[PDB]
Amino acid sequence: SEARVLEDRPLSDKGSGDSSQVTQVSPQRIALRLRPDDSKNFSIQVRQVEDYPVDIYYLMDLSYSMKDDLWSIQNLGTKLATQMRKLTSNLRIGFGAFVDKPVSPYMYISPPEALENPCYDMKTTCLPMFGYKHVLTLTDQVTRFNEEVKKQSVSRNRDAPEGGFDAIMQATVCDEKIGWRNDASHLLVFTTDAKTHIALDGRLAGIVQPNDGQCHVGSDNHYSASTTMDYPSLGLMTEKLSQKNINLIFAVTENVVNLYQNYSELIPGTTVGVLSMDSSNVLQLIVDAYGKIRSKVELEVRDLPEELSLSFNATCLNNEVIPGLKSCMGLKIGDTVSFSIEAKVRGCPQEKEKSFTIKPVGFKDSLIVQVTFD
């Protein structure tokens, strides 16, 4: 019964460079040798360091009711860069959009004049409908978000709900297309003011093929399968965003904030907020959202074989311990929070080599625990 640390590195203090060796979790690798019908424990010392680079992909709704908010995003990049600089020295910003499936009965298909712009009857010019439209990849240059905005226009769909869920998946899984960093914590800001669309909103448009975790954004920066793919469900929406180590932040208006605050319960790592209908309250929303998601150290277990289970104890701020707790709240910058995990196997499995990971949600570093039997 040995749990010797296979490799361990000192936890960093301040990150000015060489982010590839931050090593925010210690120990990194521990070899577990459990004799049949027994148990063992190992110690974990998660500690999130200051100046940890992060990347932010700003996903936005752009229906007709969503127009007036777009008139306050022309300088979001500069303002967000200054605010996030106090907490992180390296920021990456991205931009996306969505309206809905460009298909009947969501678009103005009549007359053939209206197929080029739906809002022809009210003497206004609007772009044709689109399901998802990638515009900007996450680049450390602050000016990219400033230039991308004030160029995009507003589309027009008939009903109230929008195709936001379609746009979030193309953000989640198109890692190479957008440029997710593997050594950072990812924040996905999803802003809307009205309802959103779910599965079997397809047959109402004849679009029945369900969404899959694949990336269908081609070389045109467009959801090429918009009019043939359905909407993504809750298990698809992030179980696929947990998989990419991503944190989702709802930013919705008060008239719809009730369900979203009622909906973050079933999808983890999510902090709902209130967006002023002029989108002047999103800069403070995203900053405060990270503060809660940062000082809420959890412990997600991935690829855990059914032959064994894990028992969790917590040692949060102050020496007081909380038995049967796998998460600590109310932390701050640089806090060191210990944990205790007891691993119990049933008899001896006929594998003799398995590996599961103990990971803080939305964070690259994890304990690659290797369990063997003798």
Residue ranges at the known binding site for Ca(2+): 65, 68-69, 100, 157, 159, 161-162, 193, 277
Strands lying side by side in the sheet with 246-252: 136-139, 91-95, 54-60, 185-192, 246-252
Binding partner selected for residue 198 from Mg ion, another protein, Ca ion, none, CB under the kind-specific 5 to 8 Å limit: another protein
Interface of this chain with Mg ion, residues 142 to 201, rule: CB under 5 A: 194
> Which of the choices Mg ion, Ca ion, another protein, none does residue 206 contact, using the CB cut-off of 5 to 8 A by kind?
another protein
- Shortest distance (Å) from residue 230 CB to Ca ion: 14
CA 317/CA 109 separation, integer angstroms: 60
> How many other β-carbons are positioned within 10 Å of the β-carbon of residue 330?
10
Residue 277 contact partner, candidates Mg ion, Ca ion, another protein, none, CB within 5 to 8 A by sort of partner: Ca ion
| Identified binder of Ca ion from the candidate list 12, 26, 157, 185, rule CB under 5 A | 157
Segment near Ca ion (CB under 5 A), from 8-16, 43-51, 104-112, 345-353? 104-112
Q: What are the residues binding another protein (CB under 8 A)?
A: 104-105, 108-111, 121, 158-161, 195-196, 198-201, 203-204, 206, 208-210, 233-236, 239, 242, 256, 258-259, 262-263, 266-268, 300-302, 304, 309
Q: Which two tokens stand for residue 135?
A: 């515009």
55 contacts 183 by C-beta, under 8 angstroms: no
DSSP string, 325-365: -----S--TT-B-EEEEEEEE-S--TTS-EEEEEE-TT-S-
The binder of 182, among Mg ion, another protein, Ca ion, none, by C-beta within 5 to 8 A per type, is none
304 Cβ contact partners less than 8 Å away, ≥ 6 residues apart = 310, 356
Residue with tokens 């680049």: 139
CA angle in degrees (0–180, nearest 5) for 169-174-175? 120
* Residues of each annotated binding site for Mg(2+): 63, 65, 162
Nearest to 171 by CA among 266, 90, 292, 60: 60
| Tokens 């490799």 sit on residue | 7
Q: Which does 82 bind (CB under 5 to 8 A by kind): another protein, Mg ion, Ca ion, none?
A: none
CB of 201 to Ca ion, least distance (A): 8
Interface residue with Ca ion among 81, 142, 257, 277 (CB under 5 A) is: 277
Judged by beta carbon, residue 24 or residue 65, the one nearer Mg ion is: 65
Among all chains, which residue has been given the structure tokens 């027994």?
38
The option from Ca ion, Mg ion, another protein, none interacting with 204 (CB < 5 to 8 A, set by class) reads another protein
Binding-site size for Mg ion (CB under 5 A) equals 3
Judged by beta carbon, residue 42 or residue 106, the one nearer Ca ion is: 106
301 binds, among Ca ion, Mg ion, another protein, none (CB under 5 to 8 A by kind): another protein
Instruction: Specify whether the CB–CB gap between 243 and 362 falls below 8 A.
Output: no
Closest Cα to residue 101, out of 218, 191, 213, 232?
A: 232
Q: How many residues does the chain have?
A: 374
Residue 63 found at the interface with Mg ion (CB under 5 A): yes
In the block, residue with structure tokens 């209908």: 277
Biggest CA pair distance of the chain: 78
Between 201 and 300, whose beta carbon lies closer to Ca ion?
201
Q: How many helices (H) and strands (E) does the chain have?
A: 8, 14
**H-only helix segments in 86-214:** 143-148, 164-173, 175-178
Q: Which stretch binds Mg ion (CB under 5 A): 29-37, 63-71, 104-112, 331-339?
A: 63-71
- Binding site, annotated residues: 63, 65, 68-69, 100, 157, 159, 161-162, 193, 277
Q: Which is nearer to Ca ion, 253 or 315 (CB)?
A: 253
Site residues for Ca ion per CB under 5 A = 68-69, 100, 106, 157, 159, 277
Site residues for Mg ion per CB under 5 A = 63, 65, 194
